[model samples]
Target: MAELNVEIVAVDRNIWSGTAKFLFTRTTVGEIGILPRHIPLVAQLVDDAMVRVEREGEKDLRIAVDGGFLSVTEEGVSILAESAEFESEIDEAAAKQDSESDDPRIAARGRARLRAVGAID
Candidate 1:
């Protein structure tokens, strides 16, 4: 199997950069999956969504993103996000509690984190 160079960038800093066997993200049209040599294209990322990366000999990486754009090229996938965080960076308990908040953004963020971390379906 081939690998992809995945780069995930937040507005403030780079969140993740590495190689992966596959990628999964929510787009405006819907969820899309990526593998090596995928056709180049661009898509709008869904807010408060989880991005998953599958690796060869490692745990799958997950990221919670506020919103962003996904760009795919011959090299790999690039995520330019307004804000992004890794599963380990989020407070699961707090996020789960806040996921039911009245604020949509906050709720979304919480849900995103939870989903990314596999805490929720």
Candidate 2:
């Protein structure tokens, strides 16, 4: 019955910005669920689980996060994802190449992990 205004944004573009009835994701503190008026928190995000923002009832918008910082202020929760991509945006060959290359910055911290908790709607 309650929700939080969360905006998942990147430097290049805005990924998602909306009021979500439910948000499921992970932080450096472990997994977390944020609802409306949640205690304001500044969290360190890591690469582990896909972040899910519930669109409406029983459906979710998902994204793969590399790593970043998440800050929840009185204004709203801001997710500064280091790198994020929807399933459709993922280029398999490019990802594989990035993963295998010598560049640690392009490597995958964790590949294909899933997590869920709390209610979506």
Each candidate structure's TM-score, on Cα atoms with residue i matched to residue i, is: 0.83, 0.69
Off by over 4 Å in 1: 56-58
Instruction: Please give the lDDT score at residue 80 for candidate 1.
Output: 90
Model 1 pairs whose backbones collide: none
On the 0 to 100 scale, the lDDT of residue 64 in model 2 is 63
What's model 1's lDDT at 60? 71
CA-lDDT, candidates in order: 0.75, 0.62
**Candidate 1 C-alpha lDDT tens digits along 3-114:** 8788888999988877778877878888788877778899988676556666755657767777788888767578898878776766666576757765665677777667
Total backbone clashes of model 1? 0
